[PDB]
Symmetry: D2
Subunit: 266 residues, 4 copies
């Protein structure tokens, strides 16, 4: 006779958990996460910003890389998120306890973050993480300014209701670099058509493809670097093959159209 199943941990490919040293993207922007999960540190004269933290177990590694960059826990002022799933917002709660950082997010992302990713529209309770509270709610197109760097939120609902692209302008070799940290556009295992928990899912994804295509985008980065053709382990050529935002959006739309057709057939 038969017990209920044990809880199953959210396990991921080893490369998603492989620590890397900070990799410079532009004068003040660094990848400080793992080989296969993005966590961006932007350093200003008035404190640092973190965009995503990856998986829950990455908090100490992130703090190590911040220290290596000259950023103490008191100096981390702000955490921004692409979206509030365990593999991108995992360590936010612990980061808030261990640093000065406050979280800014849209209402959708704040609600999901506050329930630790539980009751996910598509994953249920299978992919949860420690809950965290947002300190500031942001609206579409709202700006947040830290030490003179202006971050603009561009909502791009689909992968989660609260999915957001964050854009800012850094410098490199003396010239401006418009960085676009565009969120995921995948729909892994999702029911796309007639989903009662997300009735306008398709319309939202389509609008989001268009939003991504039009972002100010000298350099695209994505929460999973492979989605934008980054290779964080490739050193001086890590970003050489990166997609434009236009190409990223088009590829995501072609994949989505294929998934729709397969869902209709399945």
């Amino acid at each position: 006779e038969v017990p209920l199943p044990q809880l199953r941990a959210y396990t991921v490919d080893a490369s998603w958990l492989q620590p890397m040293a900070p990799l410079q993207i532009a004068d003040h922007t660094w990848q400080i996460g793992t080989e296969d999960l993005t966590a961006l540190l932007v350093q200003t004269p008035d404190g640092a910003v973190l965009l995503d933290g990856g998986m829950p177990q990455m908090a100490s590694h992130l703090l190590d890389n911040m220290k290596a960059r000259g950023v103490t826990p008191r100096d981390l002022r702000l955490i921004l998120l692409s979206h509030a799933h365990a593999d991108h917002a995992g360590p936010v709660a612990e980061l808030k306890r261990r640093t000065g950082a406050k979280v800014a997010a849209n209402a959708e992302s704040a609600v999901l973050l506050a329930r630790g990713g539980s009751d996910d529209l598509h994953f249920g309770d299978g992919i949860t993480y420690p809950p965290a509270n947002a300190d500031r709610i942001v609206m579409d197109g709202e700006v947040i300014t830290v030490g003179g760097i202006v971050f603009t939120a561009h909502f791009m609902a689909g992968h989660t209701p609260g999915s957001t692209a964050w854009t800012w302008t850094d410098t490199r070799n003396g010239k401006p670099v418009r960085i676009a940290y565009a969120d995921s556009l995948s729909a892994p295992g999702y029911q796309l058509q007639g989903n009662p928990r997300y009735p306008h899912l398709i319309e939202d994804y389509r609008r989001s493809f268009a939003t991504v295509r039009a972002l100010p985008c000298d350099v695209l980065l994505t929460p999973h670097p492979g989605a934008s053709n980054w290779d964080y382990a490739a050193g001086a050529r890590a970003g050489a093959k990166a997609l434009t935002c236009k190409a990223y959006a088009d590829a995501a739309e072609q994949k989505f159209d294929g998934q729709l057709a397969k869902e209709t057939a399945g």
Copy 2:
């Protein structure tokens, strides 16, 4: 020499606080609020639904009218909201403590409700009320079904980010009546253009006018009855002069266009 000002209470016209007896809208739908604030009771064989409660001080009156209708506190199963301002969601926290009711709302409305209307995009802390938690987060177009009555959410952001129209089909004289409880479309004292806390405000209002115009709408009701030309004190002719959703949307858009022009001149 000069102390800081006393706190100022949110005071309203007396008619907004004038109790009225239940007024039947359709076979299972009743206005149970005050003369000038809507609070709709929908009674099903499987419990009752309340859409809005008006001002914070209306909780006991609402429970009295429920009792008059045969609805005990245990029988109130669900509270839905047009939007989470003090004059419409005021008594929600107290209602939850005193009844079996659970709150369903979109993420925007849930976030504002949970802070008691504080840090409002336009009103600051001037119009607050007891905070309440939502039990279920709803997405645009999602349905909720109670005792066979199907409520559909139609987001219509503008007056608040989370503004929602709720629609359902009741019966009257044997025939179906498609009821549309459309939210407010006013922008009282709002900065419309270039608002840093709401950058896409104008676009959102315009989309919301179009949403309202197209709602299934044999009968329109609104949180302030005067917005839809209801007169709750007029008895058997309370709804005789009611606007169509098309006319409500058009009138709101003409007012909004005038406010835009005046803001440009002011």
Copy 3:
């Protein structure tokens, strides 16, 4: 070279996950959990009360047993908790989404429940579960009355800050039965002396031993049945060997004294 560890799921002995049929404790009280985790259903003419739910994956089983007892989801009115760890409050969030149930708990238990057991004073983030909100905060000695059954809270801090014993009087064979659902008194792996996250831990445990010893207690039950010598699989003799509250408290204090001495030596 070496990735960060995978997240580790909270795994438990199979007997803790072994479903059992409802086992009657008294005229209106039933064990409806698993062989080795208590979940008590108290059925009244005015709805049902659940005290604990066990592990997160037990929600559907609990609802099955409620249905077997004549309790539909609408009829579950109240969830009470011994303490807010994953193996006792695990399924609370899901139960709230799927039933009419509202949660009453003390402030300590409410705070831990709302963070899904994360940032535990002793376990860190190793034993988390879906977060849930409390609907009512209870004070020490406060009563809650459902369908004529009066539940009294007795705080007994130690195993968690919010640990609570719940007492009520049922009937059996015509006579009153004072049931005491006393919380855990273990300190598994805890640093007892000089704990910076719990400076008065020892004093609290000692007061809690005394609280437990003095409870009205014709029948003791505990979250882990083995702690009170229940054997839920033993049928008509499941409770034959149960400890008195006095014996439970004394045994827990002797164990605690031994742990203190071993900690001083270790």
Copy 4:
């Protein structure tokens, strides 16, 4: 005929709202509130701590006084509270939005703060303020250390369940000064005996009198300065007449005993 009453604002004596310039208590501790409400700034080489903020409308004044003291918004690291009523925690939410400050509080105070003082055990919804979230939950006797100043929490439940005394050691004229910021011990309009929302109220107050009497206490301060015989407008003699903690506790107990006798007679 008769509308429901207008909401009534929480109004206070003018002196409670009368701004004052910073008044030095010890080398690093300043009163920065109003004439009749305490708000303590402790300045360290590693940022500043605020203990209480007074009424909701005091936020800007507090920030002005911080600026006068050399404390920018980024430099405010921590807010601690005596208890979470509107006249002491009023501006906490706004302070968090406008500074780097994080809130540490016990579970009881955190729960009341998060509901903006609504559903108060004694005041109902009559004395509410903007809700705020705590960033860290503290246990009885726990320490928090900022820039080398060690703050110790001493729970003293009664006026609110979460009432706390905060103690720390500053210096003055070269010598250590043990400062005790003891919470209120009043019970304004409270039902003391047999209160169903607070069954152990009397026992808690009695234990709290004893806690206060034994605090390390070279200098006592209280949320209402008059309770400890401070006169913030008296300049160089503001603290000359201050009570010892022993005298404060004894006076509060004599008042409480009188209130008990009057309640028995009333």
